Amino acid sequence: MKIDIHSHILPKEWPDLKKRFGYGGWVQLQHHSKGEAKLLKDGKVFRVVRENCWDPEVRIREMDQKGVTVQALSTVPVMFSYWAKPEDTLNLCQLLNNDLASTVVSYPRRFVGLGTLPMQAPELAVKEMERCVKELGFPGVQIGTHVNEWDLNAQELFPVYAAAERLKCSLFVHPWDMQMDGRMAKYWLPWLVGMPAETTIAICSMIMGGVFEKFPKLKVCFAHGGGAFPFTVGRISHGFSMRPDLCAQDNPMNPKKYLGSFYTDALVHDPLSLKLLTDVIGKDKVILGTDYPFPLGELEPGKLIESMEEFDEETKNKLKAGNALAFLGLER
Amino acid sequence: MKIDIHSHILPKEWPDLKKRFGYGGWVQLQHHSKGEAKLLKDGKVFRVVRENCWDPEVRIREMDQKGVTVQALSTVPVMFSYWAKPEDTLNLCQLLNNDLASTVVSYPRRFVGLGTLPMQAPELAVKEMERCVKELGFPGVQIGTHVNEWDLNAQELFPVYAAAERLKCSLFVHPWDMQMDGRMAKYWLPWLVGMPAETTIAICSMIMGGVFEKFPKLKVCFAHGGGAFPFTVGRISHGFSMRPDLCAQDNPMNPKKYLGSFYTDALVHDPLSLKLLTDVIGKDKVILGTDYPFPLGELEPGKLIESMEEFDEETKNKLKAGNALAFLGLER
Numbered sequence: 138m139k140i141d142i143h144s145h146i147l148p149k150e151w152p153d154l155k156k157r158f159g160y161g162g163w164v165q166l167q168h169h170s171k172g173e174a175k176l177l178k179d180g181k182v183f184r185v186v187r188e189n190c191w192d193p194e195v196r197i198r199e200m201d202q203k204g205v206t207v208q209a210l211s212t213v214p215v216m217f218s219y220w221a222k223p224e225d226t227l228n229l230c231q232l233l234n235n236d237l238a239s240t241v242v243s244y245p246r247r248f249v250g251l252g253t254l255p256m257q258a259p260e261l262a263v264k265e266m267e268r269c270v271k272e273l274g275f276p277g278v279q280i281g282t283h284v285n286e287w288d289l290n291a292q293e294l295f296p297v298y299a300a301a302e303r304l305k306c307s308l309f310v311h312p313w314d315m316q317m318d319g320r321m322a323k324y325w326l327p328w329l330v331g332m333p334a335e336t337t338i339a340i341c342s343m344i345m346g347g348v349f350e351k352f353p354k355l356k357v358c359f360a361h362g363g364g365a366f367p368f369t370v371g372r373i374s375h376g377f378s379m380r381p382d383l384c385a386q387d388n389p390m391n392p393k394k395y396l397g398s399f400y401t402d403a404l405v406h407d408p409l410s411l412k413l414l415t416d417v418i419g420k421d422k423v424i425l426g427t428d429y430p431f432p433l434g435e436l437e438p439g440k441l442i443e444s445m446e447e448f449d450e451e452t453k454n455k456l457k458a459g460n461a462l463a464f465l466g467l468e469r
Numbered sequence: 470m471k472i473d474i475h476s477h478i479l480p481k482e483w484p485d486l487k488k489r490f491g492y493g494g495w496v497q498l499q500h501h502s503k504g505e506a507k508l509l510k511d512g513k514v515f516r517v518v519r520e521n522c523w524d525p526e527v528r529i530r531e532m533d534q535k536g537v538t539v540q541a542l543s544t545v546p547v548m549f550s551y552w553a554k555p556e557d558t559l560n561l562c563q564l565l566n567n568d569l570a571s572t573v574v575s576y577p578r579r580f581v582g583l584g585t586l587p588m589q590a591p592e593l594a595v596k597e598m599e600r601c602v603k604e605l606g607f608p609g610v611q612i613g614t615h616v617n618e619w620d621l622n623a624q625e626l627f628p629v630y631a632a633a634e635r636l637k638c639s640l641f642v643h644p645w646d647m648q649m650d651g652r653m654a655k656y657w658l659p660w661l662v663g664m665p666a667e668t669t670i671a672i673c674s675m676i677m678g679g680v681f682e683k684f685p686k687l688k689v690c691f692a693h694g695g696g697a698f699p700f701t702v703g704r705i706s707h708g709f710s711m712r713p714d715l716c717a718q719d720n721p722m723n724p725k726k727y728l729g730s731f732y733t734d735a736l737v738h739d740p741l742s743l744k745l746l747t748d749v750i751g752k753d754k755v756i757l758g759t760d761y762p763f764p765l766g767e768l769e770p771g772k773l774i775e776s777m778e779e780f781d782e783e784t785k786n787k788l789k790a791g792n793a794l795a796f797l798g799l800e801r
């Protein structure tokens with residue numbers, strides 16, 4: 138009921154990305170009937186979205202009703218475009234980052250921005266992060282759980298973290314690009330399961346890959362309660378102890394030690410799950426996050442947190458605000 | 470401390486399945502240390518296994534040091550062989566179910582068998598089910614979190630469940646056949662992550678399969694605390710509310726209403742994880758299990774459970790032996 142770290146927005150419209158770059162596979166936004174807009178990935182309507190997804194005044198209005206002071210705006214993860222030619226992805230990012238900056242400058246007390254980067258091109262990414270921080274004044278950027286074949290361990294992605302740490306730029310890691318075919322192609326599994334597992338895979342890839350060790354000041358936040366992690370860190374930190382040959386290759390420390398090193402959002406729905414998340418990550422490293430305006434998100438922002446009979450005043454207002462404030466590097 | 474529901478065992482030697490069935494790609498055991506072996510996937514070896522893995526007498530001694538009263542024996546998962554020709558798998562299942570009977574006869578109050586079956590052939594596997602219960606005395610069977618493409622919801626499998634529901638034969642569902650290549654070929658992730666995900670997938674498949682609903686009397690138990698399920702059940706439950714088009718076409722009851730319908734083992738390594746599990750799955754429904762004799766298992770059987778400072782010594786008993794008996798329908 139204060140700060141929302143996990144929300145997604147889209148320009149009302151953008152150019153024919155196919156026309157613009159010369160090849161296909163991009164997404165376009167069709168406004169056909171009123172109130173609704175169809176997202177197209179060449180051919181299929183892959184998701185239908187309402188006005189709140191592109192129109193800030195509509196968002197301020199829903200925010201006002203739900204008591205939410207500020208949303209951190211990031212793009213829809215499908216816009217990452219990590220696959221395309223680096224200079225084309227970078228062109229998109231500058232356009233989505235500019236649109237993001239336009240929305241913030243208009244309600245700077247209601248929004249802050251989390252940019253996207255052309256991650257497949259680490260040098261291009263690091264340039265947009267400078268521009269995003271010095272020019273646009275973004276506190277941080279939102280990034281995928283993996284860049285094609287690279288997981289958040291690849292040393293190639295090291296120029297980006299070194300940048301983020303120097304630029305005091307936060308990192309919100311979002312699962313995306315799950316497997317969508319075959320056995321996941323049913324029961325919404327790509328989303329109920331495939332997603333938390335991408336986040337588990339990334340949290341693992343980072344710790345064991347040494348990143349938190351190499352950049353002890355790189356501030357990270359993972360989506361969806363950290364995925365399965367808070368419950369399976371026990372298994373994970375044990376397999377680590379049992380096979381240093383498979384696991385301790387790049388970073389000797391036990392995963393159990395980076396607990397308290399990173400944040401997650403509190404999007405876990407159940408109160409028993411929230412208790413554990415704070416139990417295991419710290420009442421200081423958990424951040425309210427809604428997946429606004431998507432349905433798989435928390436419909437009543439902060440409700441789960443102000444129901445916790447376990448939590449007192451300073452802890453609820455931490456999970457609801459101060460943690461966000463701390464992670465972004467802003468202040469009341 | 471009492472009953473261990475999760476232990477794997479192998480014959481000391483088995484024939485040449487390649488020069489016995491017509492094709493390679495099978496598994497076979499090789500010795501080279503008067504008490505050490507290596508398992509071959511037609512060429513190279515992927516697991517090095519001590520003597521405790523095949524010799525019953527060796528297992529009793531260790532059981533005895535550790536306070537372990539009875540072990541439930543099953544075949545190492547990689548032995549399932551769902552990919553082979555139906556017969557060339559049913560054959561191997563008889564060989565292994567028999568070398569399982571054999572061992573329980575040798576120690577009828579220290580062992581019980583959970584037989585394996587030729588799952589990619591519902592009817593064959595239905596009969597081999599009949600055997601194990603009526604002739605071999607098996608109280609259940611171990612099976613994989615999936616079968617080729619078949620997920621535990623496929624209607625091809627419904628005859629197997631009906632049969633199990635008659636024969637009063639419990640199912641221990643065990644992960645396996647995780648992704649090895651691509652992005653998982655590092656940090657052991659296939660075991661640290663793909664395994665816990667494969668279980669989560671099988672529990673979902675079964676709930677939204679309506680398997681539990683068409684078979685109220687099927688006693689099923691999952692490996693490793695149900696994977697991610699206990700933590701992510703909220704997410705799945707809320708997802709099922711929001712998208713009944715993708716989620717509820719096969720069974721309409723929200724997954725949250727099955728909390729209490731299946732067991733899991735207790736292999737979660739952490740007291741915070743164990744405590745969440747009994748709160749989500751239930752005290753009546755969590756069964757101690759060790760994964761003996763594998764390194765990712767609990768080295769000191771029953772220990773986490775006996776530390777659980779928040780369980781009365783009666784509750785610790787349900788977890789050690791109480792729940793295992795009820796599930797297998799066995800006599801204290």
Ligand SMILES: O=C(O)c1cccc(C(=O)O)n1
Pocket residue numbers: 213214215428431432433434
């Ligand atoms: O674009 C997506 O796939 C996405 C991203 C964040 C949340 C959600 C959701 O949970 O609905 N979906």
Ligand SMILES: O=C(O)c1cccc(C(=O)O)n1
Pocket residue numbers: 545546547645660760763764765766
């Ligand atoms: O045979 C397997 O693949 C297997 C089965 C259960 C546990 C383990 C393990 O986690 O060590 N490995």
Ligand SMILES: [Zn+2]
Pocket residue numbers: 143144145311360428
């Ligand atoms: Zn999101």
Ligand SMILES: [Zn+2]
Pocket residue numbers: 475477643692760
């Ligand atoms: Zn096992």
